[PDB]
Amino acid sequence: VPDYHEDIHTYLREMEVKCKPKVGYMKKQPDITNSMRAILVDWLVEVGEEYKLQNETLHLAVNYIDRFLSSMSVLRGKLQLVGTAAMLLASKFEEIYPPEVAEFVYITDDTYTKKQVLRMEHLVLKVLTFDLAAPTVNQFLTQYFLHQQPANCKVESLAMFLGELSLIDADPYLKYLPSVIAGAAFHLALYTVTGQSWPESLIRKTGYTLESLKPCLMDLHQTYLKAPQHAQQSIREKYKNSKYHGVSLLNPPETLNL
Amino acid sequence: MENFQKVEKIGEGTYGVVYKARNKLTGEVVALKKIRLDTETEGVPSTAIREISLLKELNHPNIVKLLDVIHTENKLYLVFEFLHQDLKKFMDASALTGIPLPLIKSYLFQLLQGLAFCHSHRVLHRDLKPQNLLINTEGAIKLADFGLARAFGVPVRTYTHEVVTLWYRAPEILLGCKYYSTAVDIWSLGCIFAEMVTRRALFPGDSEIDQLFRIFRTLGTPDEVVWPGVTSMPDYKPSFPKWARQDFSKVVPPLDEDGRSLLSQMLHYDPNKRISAKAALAHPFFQDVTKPVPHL
Ligand SMILES: N=C1NC(=O)/C(=C/c2ccc(-c3ccc(C(=O)O)cc3)o2)S1
């Protein structure tokens, strides 16, 4: 545990603000909806599980897609192409072994060609102006985990579970920064498993009070309670498995007392 | 791309060739890194993708400046500020005379500032060798070649093992360690510092095992006292010869008490005990520091 922790925290806090999508971009998309993006993101969860991709890669690709749809109108039948090129770029950036273009083409069931996937890769790089090193809920959560006195695996798995649930729903989660969603997710995971709250050391590190996490945390408590009813279910399935301590099987708290 | 006239191929980088070029309209002398591309295969190489995005984040006097990305269908060019030569050529050209200690001190001070900036913006360089460190006529040195570089996490995950040119590769990589971080860049810089002092590579191994043994013969063979956890590392063998530590007065004769203190902190076995680039900048070796011009 080094000498760069605070410097990096401070820099990622500047970067998350420069890397955010436009909150209302979906109201200006004439052919696609939030429920279409929710189907796309849920599918990327499956793609990631199929290829054994890091959670970080999932978070990155969702950031690339949301910033891309911030300035670019996309018709519904071209949306999965945006998502595929984004997951290709995220894998190239973050993975030790990124899957191949031909493998990306196979998982779209030949919906697009190789030429198309690669032409879209070039357009996403153009639109994003090569700015791919974006902060994610993931990056913040892992820093926050260092404050659990002492390390609880179910808390960490549930925090990851909750931070991933937030990717699916642009309304409401596009409103909040990665660091806030991660605070909320961590607090809620902690509270559910152990009964403890957002710790004082993190209030101090982040500048975030439990009150200030309240709006995101009200939302995420709702998303958690309604998770088993939700149209998209790939995250719940993934988080049932024993590498996640089966945390999507735990019962949410009925009440937060906040 | 039609505003550039090519002057000369000035090398092959980690991937693709580097040319000297001039801007036909402004006169500006630039370095072009040409990267070859495929449809019919993988797209933009993951190596170019990392390099360009990390370079966008890394604006510092001691980090080579990316001026433009010329992204065609067929070809990808990176446009860089032009620098005179690399440290390996400088080192060869002054192999008989030596590099003046005030300029060794300068160059190390600057490499450490570039590196501190990298590390505190969550980037690992992972390929610090003298040919990736460029110098100008004015006494400046810069980190270049971010093709093998990586944005890291706090705390780190497992990254590519296949990492760092053998001669500058840290013992924790050599010993098959699960995690590595910023201390691997400090190791390489320790190696380079010594190389500047003595004019020869500190640890010129020719395989992973030979590299380890050259390290062991100089610094002593590490044990549980010196490095908690070593004997429990994946490629550690308890049959390794046990050599004693060589005295730095012999290892790097030209260097004063401060320079030897710093080097031994940069070549610490334990990655957690090994000095950081920020701490190294604060070392007494640098109290006197000036910005001499290379006597070429
Ligand atoms: N491998 C590389 N990665 C970069 O970013 C590079 C940028 C760059 C700028 C200038 C040079 C350069 C390299 C070598 C020489 C000589 O050997 O004379 C002269 C100039 O490289 S080179």
Coordinates of C-alpha atoms in Angstrom, one line a residue, chain A residues 52 54 56 90 109 117 124 129 145 171 186 191 211 234:
Chain A
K52 CA -14.0 -14.1 -18.6
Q54 CA -12.8 -8.2 -15.8
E56 CA -13.4 -3.0 -15.0
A90 CA -12.3 -1.7 -23.4
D109 CA -24.3 -14.0 -34.2
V117 CA -16.9 -3.7 -36.2
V124 CA -15.6 5.5 -31.4
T129 CA -10.8 11.6 -29.2
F145 CA -12.5 -1.5 0.2
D171 CA -32.4 6.8 -15.4
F186 CA -20.3 0.4 -0.4
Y191 CA -25.1 -2.1 6.0
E211 CA -26.3 12.5 4.1
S234 CA -27.7 -11.2 -16.2

